[PDB]
With several copies, the nearest count.
Chain A
Amino acid sequence: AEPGIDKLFGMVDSKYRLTVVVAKRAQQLLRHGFKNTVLEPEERPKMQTLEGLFDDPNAVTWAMKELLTGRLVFGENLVPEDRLQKEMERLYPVER
Chain B
Amino acid sequence: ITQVRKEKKGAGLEFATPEEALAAHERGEVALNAPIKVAGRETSVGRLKYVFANPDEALLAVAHGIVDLQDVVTVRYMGKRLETSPGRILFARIVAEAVEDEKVAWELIQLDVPQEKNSLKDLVYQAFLRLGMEKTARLLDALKYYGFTFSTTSGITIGIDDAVIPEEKKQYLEEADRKLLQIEQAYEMGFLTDRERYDQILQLWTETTEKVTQAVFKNFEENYP
Contact = CB atoms under 8 A, between A and B. Distances in A.
Complex contact flag A–B (Cβ < 8 Å): yes
Interface of A: 1-6
B133 interface: yes
B222 interface: no
B132 interface: yes
Majority secondary structure of chain B interface residues (helix, strand, loop or mixed): helix
B137 interface: yes
Nearest to A5: B134
B99 to A, nearest CB: 13
Nearest to A7: B132
Interface string B102-141: 0000000000000000000000000000001110011000
12 contacts: A1-B133, A1-B134, A1-B137, A2-B134, A3-B134, A4-B134, A5-B132, A5-B133, A5-B134, A6-B132, A6-B133, A6-B134
Interface string B136-163: 0110000000000000000000000000
Interface string B89-102: 00000000000000
Nearest to A2: B134
A88 to B, nearest CB: 32
Contacts of A1: 133-134, 137-138
Contacts of B134: 1-6
Nearest to A6: B132
Contacts of B137: 1
Contacts of B132: 5-6
Nearest to B132: A6
Given A1-B133, A3-B134, A5-B133, 5 more contacts: A1-B138, A5-B134, A6-B132, A6-B133, A6-B134
